[PDB]
Design a protein around this nucleic acid. Structure first.
Ligand SMILES: [Mg+2]
Ligand SMILES: [Mg+2]
Ligand SMILES: [Mg+2]
Ligand SMILES: [Mg+2]
Ligand SMILES: [Mg+2]
Ligand SMILES: [Zn+2]
Ligand SMILES: [Zn+2]
Lengths: 222, 45, 38, 162, 97, 131, 176, 68
RNA sequence: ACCAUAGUAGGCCUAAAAGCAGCCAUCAAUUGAGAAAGCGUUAAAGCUCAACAAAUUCACCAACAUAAUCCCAAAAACUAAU
């Protein structure tokens, strides 16, 4: 004998037309003819843009930083389009098209001579940026089950997250930070310049607070 | 209250005390009351 | 056998056993599911 | 303690269960409000592999272990008991709890190698042929990480990998 | 229930289960009776007869089987558990006959 | 331990409680049986053969049965309800045609029961049947 | 040796499919079953399909038991339609009253599955209404004055709907 | 077979009894909307049957990712 | 571990679509069981899950080979250490 439990009933969920993921382009319709410098600050540091949900209730959260290109976009599009139900699910891109060009020199020739030819296009993704946001009238478990295969094959580490899971790990980070037992922390050392640590540390580390080093983000850092 | 203890056939010897007290209440009566009792029982059953 | 990095059951009759310090998928009905962690 | 007796008397098999008197718990624990048997007797972070008198309490006569539903222990301390019983068994303690097979004691082998604090099994460890330098060293584990929470009277941590 | 069904109990002739339901130590006997009286065990062979004797003051929970190796297995389950009774029953009655 | 959280009885639990109260109130014959897994055809034929003389049968979970029958006047039936069980239900008790069913199949035990606020055994049911 | 569930029409029992490969796989003679089925069924002149249980035996003989007919043919004969609804819920198949469902409830009260059940007539009328929920025929409590106008409208409406469906099917077959 | 129901053919195809012969409970039950979870009383066995059916629906939706 | 019986080949298309190439409904029996969550068939048949009833120690993710002359201080889990 066991006791029954109430099922979550979703009556306010509206499925928009064309619930599948929109097809993205290899190259944007206007090509960039000017070759610009490869900024790494679009990978470095925490994400500021599109860190929150808009319509859907599930997402792919990026724990690390990195570049996404047309192979990864086709991967996500094909995998979600064959693994979801169009009647019960809708999906949405939270990332733009590949717009930053990445160039290559014709391999085998010497260093110098100038810039190379434009090879492909990528999108920079920081840590904490949502990639694909999904909504529907069903639970998180099957959505997590088919989104972990998508999130595993991405370059940066990634997770299948919900609204409750994202707030759970965020307030977990806050309670760990306010339940620090040692009196010495990265903020107190770096902002006050303790032991002349700014000679070794970066000026970006005052904002990063030691949780970010390059493109790598460690959530256990506090 | 509580129910009976349900004795079994291995050592059945305990008759209910209600039966014995009804037998004694019958046996403490005269024959005019025997006839009245028999008439009142024949009328009911 | 198949030597693998992560182990999973390809059917419900497979079982986990720790032998010789390593983890084993052993299956009786389908012997093709025999897998060994590396 | 219940034992089963199987009797063969002329194509008739009789299987019976008999109760033998069992020892009881000691009357006065020092910490009566504790739930768990170790954690109410204040032996948490105290016992080791050497404590034979306590490891003999939660074991079978054939060297087996009793389940946690019977023993009543908390899960981490049950795992600590299991690791310490395994360590004592490979260390050569509890000699009377081996099973009896009289045909097998007579064919002697090479003498038993004296050992203690064995986290792993003797038969499943590969020899470290390659070893390593100081900047990458393959360290032989001695003792178990489940027992790092014991008290340190010297104050130094217990070196588990050497 | 499945262990007796897989093992081919067609070599068994007679089963009887004599118990007193008003006692406290007969639940293993009831579980063993429900194991030997399940559907697959019953349809393993139709020539085996099972008897469920119910008493009150018999004061002995017991099971007794006869099978055609000349053998009669009688075991009084009062302190025995149902798994022990099933294991001993199978490991005797399939090894003999 | 922390202080005990008070578990709330739900609508299903209360519905089964008043169902047990009703079947123990209005009926004259309540019989206990050791429930045996049968063929499903044999089960439904058994239901029809009990419909032939108006006796019904239910299964009630012991999780909601045992405390109610421990507070009730039928506390002596608790050793018959430790294991798997079945409840036989009659208005107007007549037990020749029920024991005729229970002797036609040899492996459905009759453990006990209560007829007219008196608790009887299987041999007591047999004597009450011949009476 | 096994069980076969076969829905066979009343006056047509033939030594061919689906009775051929199903019953001939068991090793049972088809002509003997056809003769006995025709003999048992020929007293019913209604022309109604029957679900039948064939218990094929290990000695290659057979036993036959006849049950009550199908809810689909019952409600199709009650509503006067030849086929069921293509899209259940988007459209209605037919219109009947409660008297058809109640009569079908008394007919199916002697079925092999439900006569062995002890359930009342409310259970079987709920079963037939629940079958109608997927079969597409919607019942009405009291339509007896209104069902004349309802049939007079709905026959013309469903004639237009069937003509449009046939035209769409012909256009789809031409474009495919 | 094919049969068309008319003014005479809908009443002569069967035995059309008066409404007073018929009970109350065929008129009692609903026709077109199935009962939902919020409508039914919580102390009704049909409510718990509907909740159990929703639980099997939830379990079937959860078990769509089976690897076996 | 334990157990699986009802309308019912739910309605269309199709040579066949019997829970299960596809589309639409997703009702209704028995305390108990989804017009069916996985295997299987040409179509079936059949084997499993959920549901009763029997009980209940805990159960969310995590583990991943290698090079060439000969491996590379020896070794140590507790006598008190800001
Ligand atoms: Mg990756
Ligand atoms: Mg139901
Ligand atoms: Mg199950
Ligand atoms: Mg290799
Ligand atoms: Mg050296
Ligand atoms: Zn396998
Ligand atoms: Zn403890």
């Amino acid at each position: 004998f066991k006791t029954l439990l109430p099922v979550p009933t979703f009556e306010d969920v509206a499925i928009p037309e064309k619930p599948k993921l929109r097809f993205v382009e290899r190259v944007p319709l206007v090509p960039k003819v000017r070759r610009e410098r490869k900024n790494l600050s679009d990978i470095r540091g925490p994400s500021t843009e599109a860190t929150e949900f808009t319509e859907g209730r599930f997402a792919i959260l990026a724990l690390g930083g990195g570049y996404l290109h047309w192979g990864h976009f086709e991967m996500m599009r094909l995998t979600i389009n064959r693994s979801m139900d169009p009647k019960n699910m809708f999906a949405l891109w939270r990332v733009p098209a590949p717009f930053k060009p990445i160039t290559r020199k014709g391999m085998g020739q010497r260093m110098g001579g100038g810039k190379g030819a434009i090879d492909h296009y990528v999108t920079p993704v920081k840590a904490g940026r949502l990639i694909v946001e999904m909504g529907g009238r069903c639970e998180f478990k099957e959505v997590q089950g088919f989104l972990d295969l998508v999130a595993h094959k991405l370059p940066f580490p990634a997770k299948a997250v919900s609204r409750e899971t994202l707030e759970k790990m965020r307030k977990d980070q806050e309670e760990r930070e306010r339940n620090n037992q040692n009196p010495w922390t990265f903020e107190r050392i770096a902002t006050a310049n303790m032991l002349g640590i700014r000679k070794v540390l970066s000026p970006y580390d005052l904002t990063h607070k030691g949780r970010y080093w390059g493109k790598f983000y460690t959530p256990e850092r506090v | 209250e509580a129910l009976a203890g349900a004795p079994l056939d291995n050592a059945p010897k305990e008759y209910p005390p209600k039966i014995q007290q009804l037998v004694q209440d019958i046996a403490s009566l005269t024959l005019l009351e025997i006839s009245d009792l028999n008439e009142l029982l024949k009328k009911t059953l | 056998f198949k030597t693998k990095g992560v182990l999973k059951k390809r059917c419900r009759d497979c079982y986990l056993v720790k032998r010789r310090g390593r983890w084993f998928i052993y299956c009786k009905t389908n012997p093709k599911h025999k897998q060994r962690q590396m | 303690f219940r034992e089963v007796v199987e009797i063969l008397d002329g194509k008739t098999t009789i299987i019976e269960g008999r109760i033998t008197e069992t020892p009881q718990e000691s009357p006065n624990p020092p910490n009566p409000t504790g739930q768990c048997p170790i954690c109410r007797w204040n032996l948490k972070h105290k016992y080791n592999y050497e404590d034979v008198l306590l490891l003999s309490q939660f074991i079978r006569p054939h060297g087996g272990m009793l389940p946690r539903r019977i023993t009543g222990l908390c899960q981490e301390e049950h795992l600590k008991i299991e690791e310490c019983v395994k360590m004592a068994h490979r260390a050569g303690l509890l000699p009377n709890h081996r099973p009896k097979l009289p045909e097998g004691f007579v064919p002697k082998s090479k003498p038993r190698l004296n050992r203690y604090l064995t986290r792993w099994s003797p038969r499943s460890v590969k020899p470290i042929y390659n070893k390593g330098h100081r900047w990458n060293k393959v360290r032989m584990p001695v003792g178990s990480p489940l027992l790092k929470d014991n008290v340190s009277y010297s104050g130094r941590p217990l070196l588990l990998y050497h | 229930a499945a262990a007796l069904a897989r093992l081919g109990l067609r070599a068994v002739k007679q089963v009887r289960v004599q118990f007193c339901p008003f006692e406290k130590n007969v639940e293993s006997t009831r579980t063993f009776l429900q194991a030997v009286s399940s559907e697959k065990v019953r349809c393993t062979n139709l020539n085996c007869s099972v008897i469920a004797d119910v008493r009150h003051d018999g004061s002995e929970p017991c099971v007794d089987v006869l099978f055609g190796d000349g053998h009669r297995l009688i075991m009084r389950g009062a302190h025995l558990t149902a798994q022990e009774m099933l294991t001993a029953f199978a490991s005797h009655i399939q090894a003999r006959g | 331990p922390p202080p005990t959280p008070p578990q709330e009885e739900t609508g299903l639990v209360r519905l089964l409680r008043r169902e047990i109260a009703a079947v123990f109130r209005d009926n004259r014959m309540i019989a206990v049986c050791q429930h045996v897994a049968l063929s499903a055809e044999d089960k439904l034929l058994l239901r029809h053969q009990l419909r032939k003389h108006k006796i019904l049968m239910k299964i009630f979970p012991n999780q909601v049965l045992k405390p109610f029958l421990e507070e009730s006047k039928y506390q002596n039936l608790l050793p018959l309800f430790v294991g798997h069980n079945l409840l036989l239900v009659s208005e107007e008790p007549k037990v020749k045609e029920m024991v005729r069913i229970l002797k036609g199949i040899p492996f459905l035990p009759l453990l006990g029961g209560c007829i007219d606020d008196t608790i009887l055994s299987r041999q007591g049911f047999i004597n009450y049947s011949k009476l | 040796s096994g069980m076969i569930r076969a829905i066979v029409r009343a006056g047509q029992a033939r030594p061919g499919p689906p009775l051929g490969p199903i019953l001939g796989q068991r090793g049972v003679s088809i002509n003997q079953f056809c003769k006995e089925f025709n003999e048992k069924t020929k007293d019913i002149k209604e022309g109604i399909p029957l679900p039948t249980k064939i218990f094929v035996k290990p000695d290659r003989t057979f036993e036959i038991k006849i049950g009550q007919p199908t809810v689909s043919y019952f409600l199709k004969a009650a509503a006067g339609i030849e086929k069921g609804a293509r899209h259940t819920g988007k459209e209605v198949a037919g219109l009947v009253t409660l008297k058809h469902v109640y009569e079908i409830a008394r007919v199916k009260a002697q079925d092999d599955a439900f006569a062995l059940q002890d359930v009342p007539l409310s259970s079987v009328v709920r079963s037939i209404i629940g079958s109608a929920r997927s079969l597409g025929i919607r019942v009405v409590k009291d339509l007896s004055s209104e069902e004349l106008a309802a049939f007079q409208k709905e026959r013309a409406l469903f004639l237009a709907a069937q003509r449009e469906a046939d035209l769409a099917a012909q256009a789809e077959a031409a474009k495919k | 077979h094919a049969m068309g129901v008319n003014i005479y053919k809908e009443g002569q195809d069967v035995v059309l009894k008066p409404d007073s012969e018929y009970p109350e409970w065929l008129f009692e039950m609903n026709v077109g909307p199935p009962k939902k979870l919020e409508e039914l009383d919580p102390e009704t066995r049909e409510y718990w049957r509907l909740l159990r059916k929703h639980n099997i629906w939830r379990h079937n939706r959860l078990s769509k990712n089976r690897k076996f």
